[PDB]
Amino acid sequence: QLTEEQIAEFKEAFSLFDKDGDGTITTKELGTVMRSLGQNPTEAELQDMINEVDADGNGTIDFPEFLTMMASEEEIREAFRVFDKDGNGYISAAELRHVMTNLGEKLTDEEVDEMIREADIDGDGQVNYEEFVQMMT
């Protein structure tokens, strides 16, 4: 049972996927998101991704089902490489900004800095792989 703050936070995340704002994430919307992250899932894999979390079997992710879902090493490495575009071992504010922009979310530099700060543990102002793992685990 999450907090009001956290729900609002996840609502913000959910909105990155729901491109038409109709309160439902479709396979087409998930596909758009995934391609904006450098991936190319097939129609079937997109259905599968939706199926794992779909409570009412209606084809799409609504907001409750999105939250439930948010309940391996190679998977985390592969995801880190999406953000760490120059492969230097650190996700910079600029790299995070780029990814968010391509997702259709134009953040101010302060908002980009706060997102990094939340994940940064050593306080060098970037996210390394170990900090990234911790964020997820």
């Binding site: 956290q6 936070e9 995340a13 990155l16 992250l37 592969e78 995801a79 999406v82 995070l96 994940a119």
Partner: peptide
Amino acid sequence: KKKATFRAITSTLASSFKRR
């Protein structure tokens, strides 16, 4: 704030990689 967003993206990536 957007650590949920940063997490959501990462999780969704992890999901996609799973079914390779």
